[PDB]
């Protein structure tokens, strides 16, 4: 028993981290097979960071200008290209530590682990969620750009995120591994609006099921509700509307605990309307939304 | 910016996990050089788990009874011995993935990462603290025994914990890598009292400094206090007494922020006496104590 914000073991990803330098800018790259992936803003300078013309900036760069270092060994760059907001540097050596991998574009509300890196060196790993507004609340300092987010299914790493920037509000924005930003963000030093964020309702319900499984049951009540009544409350409290797809994904947890999804919705409704009254659930004094129903089943069953 | 409960990258530890089976019991082992370390309770059975005579039980076991598997390859056991509550199985092959390592006995209040494992396979990584009562609030299911806790200093892994058991209260107990339990716990299926736990005051103050660095400053007030006055409040709220050693370790954070340690103690005093009034600090609605002053500096400076 016990419930923790657990990240995937980062080993398969640590073996892929490299340092990329262009001019005087250094950030992280991801070395998979004979390609190194990194944020294209590695080619920009302070003079043009307000509105870089990446096409023109990349034209002034040659293969030998991209310095790629894997630990202490230098990689030879034999090709370079820009795909959306990522640079793909073809190298002459395939990474011997390349795990089985996929590039995936995650949905908002889904979770992933982040391996924060500096100078191509891993510093730490944490679990987070892609917010409904397509930002992530990470921990990233200068030099963390190019750090990636991922999920692991047995031996396969699905890379889903590459860090590009911190908004003036302290939240983080990035791309999938094809260089497409999550959300409306652009890779330029400008004030950018992150939309109204909402709480991931299906994840809070999944976490409430995790709480019941682990013995924290005080919030269970003698009430039920309907999807429509619940959604009136969800809208009032800036929670995502619950759909029948969300109810269906909660099926296994409803089955294991014997608590119907709409009965758990009534418990959640009461917690939203009345607060926690100074109590905690799984060591938290607020409603946690960064655990998916998949994460709860995985953690509560022991998926390695 | 941003503040997360970050674990160390687990790669160096993943390379050391093996599966150990004895009779019909399977748990995890840690393969370092030519030795595999695991909980000695791997040799016990349901009939004798209430009070095992480990000396007598180990005498009925031979080297060939200990099945050690590293992924898909079987290791040859050429020696076996019990040191306190751990079994040391000498193998004929040194682990080629053995990182630079040390065995350390951590102090209560110190933090470490845990690589939860099942059948010798890593499932996830999380950061936790050794409670003042020598328990850890982990996430461990059946088969997680032998999973280890560690810290990483550049290329050196300091192993500090090996998981042995879950108390009837759902908290976790284990040993250092010499097999000595943290706390008064014994490796037997009996009701065991975990003492009164207290909040790690120096860590809460370190986290308050992390909050200030990241912009969460609402809790700062126009007051100061003394070590003696503060400790009267700490005792009332089951917080560890703050010593001058704790004030000294907070020195760097006091210097960076310009907030004297006793002024931060007055902010903490007010938060204890008045609560959070429905507000949050670093995304938490309670006072976090599982970040040491070292963790706050590391995360806020980018130590890889
Ligand atoms: C995140 C990271 O590691 N890096 C590499 C170093 C430069 C850095 N920033 C520049 C770019 C410009 C284009 C849009 C994204 C950010 C700067 C911005 C100014 C700040 O004062 C320091 C980091 C990105
Ligand atoms: C934690 C773990 O992986 N393992 C291996 C499988 C047996 C397990 N437990 C037995 C020992 C007995 C000695 C004291 C520590 C626990 C059992 C206890 C009973 C429970 O119902 C299942 C796990 C330890």
Curated annotation (Swiss-Prot), chains A, B:
Subunit record text: 3CL-PRO exists as monomer and homodimer. Only the homodimer shows catalytic activity. Interacts with host FBXO22; this interaction promotes the proteasomal degradation of nsp5.
Domain Peptidase C30 stretches: 1-304
Protein name: 3C-like proteinase nsp5
Segments on the Cytoplasmic face: 1-304
Gene for this chain: rep
Cell location: Host cytoplasm; Host Golgi apparatus; Host nucleus
Catalytic activity: TSAVLQ-|-SGFRK-NH2 and SGVTFQ-|-GKFKK the two peptides corresponding to the two self-cleavage sites of the SARS 3C-like proteinase are the two most reactive peptide substrates. The enzyme exhibits a strong preference for substrates containing Gln at P1 position and Leu at P2 position
Function: Cleaves the C-terminus of replicase polyprotein at 11 sites. Recognizes substrates containing the core sequence [ILMVF]-Q-|-[SGACN]. Cleaves and inactivates human TRMT1, preventing tRNA guanine(26)-dimethylation of tRNAs. May cleave human NLRP1 in lung epithelial cells, thereby activating the NLRP1 inflammasome pathway. May cleave human GSDMD, triggering alternative GSDME-mediated epithelial cell death upon activation of the NLRP1 inflammasome, which may enhance the release interleukins 1B, 6, 16 and 18. Also able to bind an ADP-ribose-1''-phosphate (ADRP).
Cross-link entry Glycyl lysine isopeptide (Lys-Gly) (interchain with G-Cter in ubiquitin), positions: 5, 90
Result, substituting residue 205 to V: In strain: Zeta/P.2
Result for mutant: residue 90 to R: In strain: Beta/B.1.351
Residues at the active site: 41 (for 3cl-pro activity), 145 (nucleophile)
Regulation: Inhibited by pyridone-containing alpha-ketoamides compounds 13a and 13b. In turn, alpha-ketoamide 13b (tert-butyl (1-((S)-1-(((S)-4-(benzylamino)-3,4-dioxo-1-((S)-2-oxopyrrolidin-3-yl)butan-2-yl)amino)-3-cyclopropyl-1-oxopropan-2-yl)-2-oxo-1,2-dihydropyridin-3-yl)carbamate) inhibits SARS-CoV-2 replication in human lung cells. Inhibited ex vivo by michael acceptor inhibitor N3. Inhibited ex vivo by compound 11a and 11b.
């Amino acid at each position: 028993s016990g419930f923790r914000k657990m990240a995937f073991p980062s080993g398969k990803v640590e073996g892929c981290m490299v340092q990329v330098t262009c001019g005087t800018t250094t950030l992280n790259g991801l070395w998979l097979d004979d390609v190194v992936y990194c944020p294209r803003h590695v080619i920009c300078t302070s003079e043009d960071m307000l509105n870089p013309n990446y096409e023109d900036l990349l034209i002034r760069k040659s293969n030998h200008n991209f310095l790629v270092q894997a630990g202490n060994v230098q990689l030879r760059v034999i090709g370079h290209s820009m795909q959306n907001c990522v640079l793909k540097l073809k190298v002459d050596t395939a990474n011997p530590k390349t795990p089985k991998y996929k590039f995936v574009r995650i949905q908002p509300g889904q979770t992933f682990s982040v391996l924060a890196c500096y100078n191509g060196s891993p510093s730490g790993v944490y679990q987070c969620a892609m917010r409904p507004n397509f930002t992530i609340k990470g921990s990233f300092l200068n030099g963390s750009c190019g750090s990636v987010g991922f999920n692991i299914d047995y031996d396969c790493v699905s890379f889903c995120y590459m860090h590009h920037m911190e908004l003036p509000t302290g939240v983080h924005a990035g791309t999938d591994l094809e260089g497409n930003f999550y959300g409306p963000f652009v890779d330029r030093q400008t004030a950018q609006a992150a939309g109204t964020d909402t709480t991931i309702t299906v994840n809070v319900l999944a976490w409430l099921y995790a709480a019941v499984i682990n013995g924290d049951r005080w919030f269970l009540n003698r009430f039920t509700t309907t999807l429509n009544d619940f959604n009136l409350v969800a809208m009032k409290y800036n929670y995502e509307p619950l759909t029948q797809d969300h109810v269906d994904i909660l099926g296994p947890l409803s089955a294991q605990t014997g608590i119907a999804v709409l009965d758990m919705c009534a418990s959640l409704k009461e917690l939203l309307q009345n607060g926690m009254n100074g109590r905690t659930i799984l060591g938290s004094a607020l409603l946690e939304d960064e655990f998916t129903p998949f994460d709860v089943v995985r953690q509560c069953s022991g998926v390695t």
